[PDB]
Symmetry: D2
Subunit: 331 residues, 4 copies
């Protein structure tokens, strides 16, 4: 296949480093070698993260089409909108964000710290629903004579949204080369879908598509899984996957998404603390903390073949921790 056919606008530092999680792994019995690829450290634009990798392939079309405003949407503590706001500012574009109440969480500063605080500082017009927002948004832009580039939730349901992470697999291969070995697995957090989509496609190439263990954080596994499966197939087409994406290539564990999207369970919190305390690597209570929780449990349940080398994709999400201050008041 050839991803190179599509331009890629530089929004990151370059390939993302892979680090070993020796302590955590040892702490879990050293039967599985845990690593982490730091998408959460990929950019100077308000901490970047997975979405910013996706955005590298969307911005050319946006620029190509002469759009002057980037418009997107997500929950109050959405990492996506924050990155869009930063990318927009860096690209000299306006930005309109529609933030809705996607989480049944009521915290005094939920709408004033973390991701959303940055978006406002970055100059985005941050529109908070009551309590069609999307179309009003696009229109107000047109109305103001601007031209909006619509970026759907997480950049996922878009023709280009699966690309970024195809190249992710492509990166892991280059690093594996210098590494003298290939990872047996890839643990990734899944919600809107195009991150795991790209990976499924990217690793399908060398037949590891089913080695990408997605961990659902949506709490709506069915939809999420179907969106990954769907987004993959389409992306595979878009790149030239000399193979087809089977409903067996899309893996999605559903044991760690509870209780609801945006709410952590006690395993989520323990996982965040375990990992932060052994590696000095933080994960959040909405996304990464759930995928981390997933891996620690998989490992702990011997679900991973001794000697296995698992690559944990850390997608970002850390700033959202500020929206859950009470839970971590004593750590």
């Amino acid at each position: 296949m050839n991803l190179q056919r599509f331009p890629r606008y530089p929004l990151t530092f370059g390939p993302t480093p892979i680090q070993p999680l020796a302590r955590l792994s040892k702490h879990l019995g050293g039967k599985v070698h845990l690593y982490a690829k730091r998408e959460d450290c990929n950019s100077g634009l308000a901490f970047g993260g997975n979405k910013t990798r996706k955005l590298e392939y969307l911005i050319p079309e946006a620029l190509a089409q002469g759009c002057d405003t980037l418009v997107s949407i997500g929950g109050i503590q959405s990492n996506q909108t924050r990155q869009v706001a930063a990318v927009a500012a860096h690209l000299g574009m306006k930005c309109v964000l529609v933030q809705e109440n996607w989480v049944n969480y009521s915290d005094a500063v939920y709408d004033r710290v973390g991701n959303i605080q940055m978006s406002r500082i970055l100059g985005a017009d941050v529109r908070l629903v009551p309590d069609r927002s999307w179309e009003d948004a696009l229109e107000s832009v047109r109305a103001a004579g601007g031209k909006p580039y619509a970026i759907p939730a997480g950049c996922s349901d878009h023709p280009l949204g699966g690309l970024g992470f195809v190249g992710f697999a492509e990166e892991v291969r280059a690093q594996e080369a210098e590494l003298g070995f290939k990872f047996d697995y890839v643990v990734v957090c899944s919600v809107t879908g195009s991150t795991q989509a790209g990976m499924v496609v990217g690793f399908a190439a060398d037949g590891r598509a089913d080695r990408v263990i997605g961990v659902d954080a949506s709490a709506k596994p069915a939809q999420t899984r179907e969106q990954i499966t769907r987004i993959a197939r389409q992306t595979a087409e878009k790149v030239g996957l000399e193979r087809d994406i089977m409903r067996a290539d899309v893996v999605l564990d559903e044991r760690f998404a509870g209780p609801e999207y945006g709410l952590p369970n006690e395993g989520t919190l323990e996982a965040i603390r375990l990992c932060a305390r052994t590696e000095g690597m933080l994960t959040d209570p909405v996304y990464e903390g759930k995928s981390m929780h997933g891996m620690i449990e998989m490992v702990r349940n011997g679900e991973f073949p001794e000697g296995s080398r698992v690559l944990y994709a850390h997608l970002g999400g850390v700033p959202a921790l500020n929206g859950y201050s009470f839970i971590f008041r004593d750590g």
Copy 2:
């Protein structure tokens, strides 16, 4: 001089990238080329930052010394203490932090968001109020503590990190094929600008390191940078003396107090964030961003100068000043 003599423990991804601040540069007139060396993006340990570069030179001694607990100190929203906590966990060491009330700011979640929040999740013993007090606590507790002063600054190895930064800059200016005429850096505890002074004294550009005070006590800050630069110049074998002309510290933007932004600070933070997508904070970086922007605007920089802004980190503290930014 010879920095290589001293061991360095990898806590960073490696050399920090330099980026053009084209939009901001153009916005201010096009007469001065501004760039940013991202020390704030140097590590996977809870955002890292400048303090993390410093730490790489102190850790070896902690390890050598067989120490098992890193002890440090700073205000409630201290970046230093958060980095020590992350480094600590990464090394598998204990961590005791003395968070003092160094800022006359009253915010309902000041001691529960941002930096301090991370230090607790990172498993550090976070004590709120003492230095010696905690240290002894550790010994009396049966553990060997490695003492890390505020900002890692007043310490024998505290200046090495940024001596290394000037070296990195050199190595990058070579690749870039051009040299920066100045460096704008925020200064509070001192060993950051101290290391740069010694580093750039090496090639005759000490006085091009333009520090901006964020302490609101320029006198002490300037003297600390000088003292640190001399002790550090001696350790690296600098074949020269640090003169007062080598320590440039602008006092115009620290106001009104440490930990407290002025309207210029916020204006600066909004401008830079909105032109480059690059965030700075109300305590440190915003104040240095503010000075650099104001310098350009005053024409204090020679038309054509290339200014390397050093972004030391600190963004997480923004969570403690949420009401100020509630509408942007």
Copy 3:
């Protein structure tokens, strides 16, 4: 029966006033006449409320025993502990409070505003968590004599006298008004507030007219505590009847979803009551009982022409720990 047998230490301004809720009644159809008894405005000690009426009958004993420290317990935004902290202060006594997290809520300032904020200012030693026993032991051990006040003052020999007095007060005021109330709406969680009332009104045959509104979300249990406390209390004031389960009325339709958490109906009732009468209620206690009464009048559960007396127990300060919910109203 005889209530005067027990000494009452004054901690209130005197009987609590009764106000008509003319606007709310009309808003709901004017078929039922709603009134309110401001237990929430009963004291100058940190806003007071129902717990303070209870405490008047417990303090003489703490003093008699020469106790020097009041010890109590409750959730983070407990009203009980805040009132106890204010009484100790007033009395000149120490105060140790065991604050437990009884609510699945995690707001950023939950342990720093509202009731708990007041307790710390009032000089109480606020310990965030055997919990209860350790506290007591610790006082003795420190050289003090602690008076034990169980949650809500409820499971305590004297916990029920305060509201036996409430019914006493009500008949007197009913006289003054030349008429009587047909029903009393009241919020129940630990039990002695409703139990006291059940006893005082049994005395005139209106026990079963004290409509309890569960806010525990564990109705069976709460209902059992009201029943028990009530029987132990009716005995202590020499009620001429043994208290029957049929004397205790506890509606459990408005308690959801959990203790300390409001439902969309709770929010609606707080808003409507606030916007028609200028009287605030909280998302943990009163708003639930308010929701209850409004719902009853609405479903036409009170006979046409009834006079309902809503007992406003207090609680308003807890509103501060639920600031996100009310950000826009």
Copy 4:
């Protein structure tokens, strides 16, 4: 003097009680007897307070004019706007509140707790502008008033603190009168009154009410504005206009208006270390709470005056607790450990 000439709509339970501050009086040496008249406990309408006493003489006019909306104004933790909001809801009137941060303070939950939170729950249209918007400059006051008209309603304008209004000082003339009535019930007299002062019609009403019996200079005002000159002038002006309004047949002299300035620091709405100790001291002896903006400053004053022997030995000092407690919620960090 004939205050009875002006109608008074009930918004209170009746005369506010007076209580002895025996514990605090004892702690300071026993040489001075402190009491508190509880205006802070005067109403069932969202905790009420002094502003509510003032409102009783304004509402009759609002009603006679057929107004359907009460429009007022104040800072973020304003006590006045919260009382207006409750009074409005109670009367079946709409309410528009014009608000802005009038304090150089910026706590994370400042605009979502305490007073302003209640106003919103009470159904007021709380129009809070962003920093630097400057309402008093753009005259947002008037726009709100006009927008009510534009919307076809009829607004009743209530100025900051009810003070600079023709009827704004009547309520506290009633306070002097009521005090006289209680001094007769009690069988004894109060030698001074301590009252926090900012917009001024509270103390102005007192000055007029007490001048009628030669006790005006007995009302010791304690500035919490940190702008004593203006505040003194507004009190004096309000006093004179009200004096005339109630037929007081005497002039209010410069000597009748007493405003201490020593306890206002460092700025309106910002407490000083003495403010905080006073709050803690009073609360820990009497179980009576006071706030960082208003009452805590006047409480600080009284305590300090007593401590400095500024009160003749044996005086009975009546502390007027004007309210304000809900505002403690906006200063949570300061009290995080008590």
